[PDB]
Amino acid sequence: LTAPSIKSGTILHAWNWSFNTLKHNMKDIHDAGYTAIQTSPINQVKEGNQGDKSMSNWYWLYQPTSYQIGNRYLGTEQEFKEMCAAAEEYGIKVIVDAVINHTTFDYAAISNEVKSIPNWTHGNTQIKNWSDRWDVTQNSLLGLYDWNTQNTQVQSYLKRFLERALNDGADGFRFDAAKHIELPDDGSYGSQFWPNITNTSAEFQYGQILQDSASRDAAYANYMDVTASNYGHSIRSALKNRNLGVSNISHYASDVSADKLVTWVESHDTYANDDEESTWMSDDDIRLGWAVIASRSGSTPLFFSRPEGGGNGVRFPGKSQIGDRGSALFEDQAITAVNRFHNVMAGQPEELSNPNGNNQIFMNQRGSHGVVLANAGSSSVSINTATKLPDGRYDNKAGAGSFQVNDGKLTGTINARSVAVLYPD
Numbered sequence: 270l271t272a273p274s275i276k277s278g279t280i281l282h283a284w285n286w287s288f289n290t291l292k293h294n295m296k297d298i299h300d301a302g303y304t305a306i307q308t309s310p311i312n313q314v315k316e317g318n319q320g321d322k323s324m325s326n327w328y329w330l331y332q333p334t335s336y337q338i339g340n341r342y343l344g345t346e347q348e349f350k351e352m353c354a355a356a357e358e359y360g361i362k363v364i365v366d367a368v369i370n371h372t373t374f375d376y377a378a379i380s381n382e383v384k385s386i387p388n389w390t391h392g393n394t395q396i397k398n399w400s401d402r403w404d405v406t407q408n409s410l411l412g413l414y415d416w417n418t419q420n421t422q423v424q425s426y427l428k429r430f431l432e433r434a435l436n437d438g439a440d441g442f443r444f445d446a447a448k449h450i451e452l453p454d455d456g457s458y459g460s461q462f463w464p465n466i467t468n469t470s471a472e473f474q475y476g477q478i479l480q481d482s483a484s485r486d487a488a489y490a491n492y493m494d495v496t497a498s499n500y501g502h503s504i505r506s507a508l509k510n511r512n513l514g515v516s517n518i519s520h521y522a523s524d525v526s527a528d529k530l531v532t533w534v535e536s537h538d539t540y541a542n543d544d545e546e547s548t549w550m551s552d553d554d555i556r557l558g559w560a561v562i563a564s565r566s567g568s569t570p571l572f573f574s575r576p577e578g579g580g581n582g583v584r585f586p587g588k589s590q591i592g593d594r595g596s597a598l599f600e601d602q603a604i605t606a607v608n609r610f611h612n613v614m615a616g617q618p619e620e621l622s623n624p625n626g627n628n629q630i631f632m633n634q635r636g637s638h639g640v641v642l643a644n645a646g647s648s649s650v651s652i653n654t655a656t657k658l659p660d661g662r663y664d665n666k667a668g669a670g671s672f673q674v675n676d677g678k679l680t681g682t683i684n685a686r687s688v689a690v691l692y693p694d
């Protein structure tokens with residue numbers, strides 16, 4: 270229900286949830302078995318399109334104007350502080366999405382607070398060659414003004430913001446566009462930006478480093494955890510073909526070890542961006558996806574709270590607005606069961622397989638303690654596989670059903686499009 274550390278638990282991405290909504294849905298998030306929560310950017314941003322709350326305006330939260338805490342979309346610093354305290358009341362940790370690689374693109378909106386720092390930016394010359402580290406780190410991403418991360422004065426300014434969040438109650442960070450901030454060994458233009466701003470009391474901290482050739486996943490891993498963006502793609506592909514074949518969904522598609530990895534089925538971008546890369550999915554595809562990644566060992570899964578009514582190609586249904594609580598899926602019986610499972614199996618090794626050679630059925634056996642089954646198939650299946658679980662009756666915790674282990678053999682009917690969580694007590 271609550272792991273001994275942010276790293277051993279499941280993180281709920283409260284995408285666009287205001288500080289007050291969060292505060293109010295704390296008992297629920299605790300009940301659902303999450304150890305940490307990830308908020309949207311908590312700082313002062315360029316509140317575009319006249320500050321309108323339509324979900325389609327979500328992107329304005331990634332265009333900072335000053336690094337003061339509080340904004341119209343999510344709320345005020347006091348509210349943030351109050352929410353961190355409400356979280357702590359149930360042992361929940363708070364993770365802050367820190368957009369520290371850039372500010373807004375609208376130069377006139379940038380605060381004096383920012384403009385006062387001598388030589389604070391690199392400019393807004395759009396990145397051209399993505400295979401070039403110099404271009405990727407030293408130039409403008411989307412025309413968003415690029416902070417001059419080599420400037421110790423900007424480092425200090427940005428770091429005091431992190432410090433302030435931690436002191437407000439926060440416990441960790443998700444470094445937005447962390448791939449666009451050079452490392453020490455990043456050639457002639459490296460810097461001590463990471464060793465510096467990473468040196469805080471933050472329990473857990475990881476960066477969004479979308480994978481490619483100039484992303485250096487294994488290098489950033491030496492400072493913070495990294496995002497397995499490719500793996501997420503493998504998962505979505507699997508769910509797409511309804512083929513949960515272990516050969517493909519077992520390699521994290523990265524050269525970083527899973528204990529320095531943050532995983533997901535989809536991110537706020539794949540869903541919310543105009544590409545609609547993962548919007549196609551439905552709650553059912555997400556349940557099976559979660560079962561697959563949140564049953565793994567060592568990797569920290571991040572659950573994405575989609576807009577009330579989103580899915581099936583529909584991004585912004587217009588049933589909620591920025592600040593409103595997301596869909597109820599975050600606390601579904603099947604999701605909750607896997608979170609609990611994920612927590613209790615901490616430390617346990619894993620072994621993946623496909624019962625009876627059926628690639629539509631995913632089985633994850635954590636030691637001789639638990640078993641997670643995911644049937645992506647459109648029909649029900651009766652299984653009969655070996656098991657390290659003791660003999661006895663096991664009721665499906667993720668939903669309805671019972672399985673019987675007998676003479677080291679698992680048997681039962683996993684319902685179509687269903688997840689099954691199996692373990693004692």
Ligand SMILES: OC[C@H]1O[C@H](O[C@H]2[C@H](O)[C@@H](O)[C@@H](O[C@H]3[C@H](O)[C@@H](O)[C@@H](O[C@H]4[C@H](O)[C@@H](O)[C@@H](O[C@H]5[C@H](O)[C@@H](O)[C@H](O)O[C@@H]5CO)O[C@@H]4CO)O[C@@H]3CO)O[C@@H]2CO)[C@H](O)[C@@H](O)[C@@H]1O
Pocket residue numbers: 328329330331332368374410411412413445446447448477479480481538542
């Ligand atoms: O006015 C400038 C700009 O404003 C808007 O742009 C929006 C984006 O549309 C929103 O997506 C958002 O962007 C955020 C993301 O939400 C945030 O998660 C993160 O994502 C970045 C990555 O960090 C960055 O690396 C890059 O990903 C690349 C990979 O690097 C590359 O390997 C792979 O091949 O391709 C991906 C995608 O190109 O880009 C993503 C975002 O797509 O950081 C960004 C920046 O904060 O917010 C911005 C700004 O509000 C308008 O939509 C846009 O048209 C306009 O140019």
Ligand SMILES: [Ca+2]
Pocket residue numbers: 370405406407408415416418449450451
């Ligand atoms: Ca940069």
Ligand SMILES: [Ca+2]
Pocket residue numbers: 353357362363438439440
């Ligand atoms: Ca805290």
Ligand SMILES: [Ca+2]
Pocket residue numbers: 545548582583584
């Ligand atoms: Ca659509």
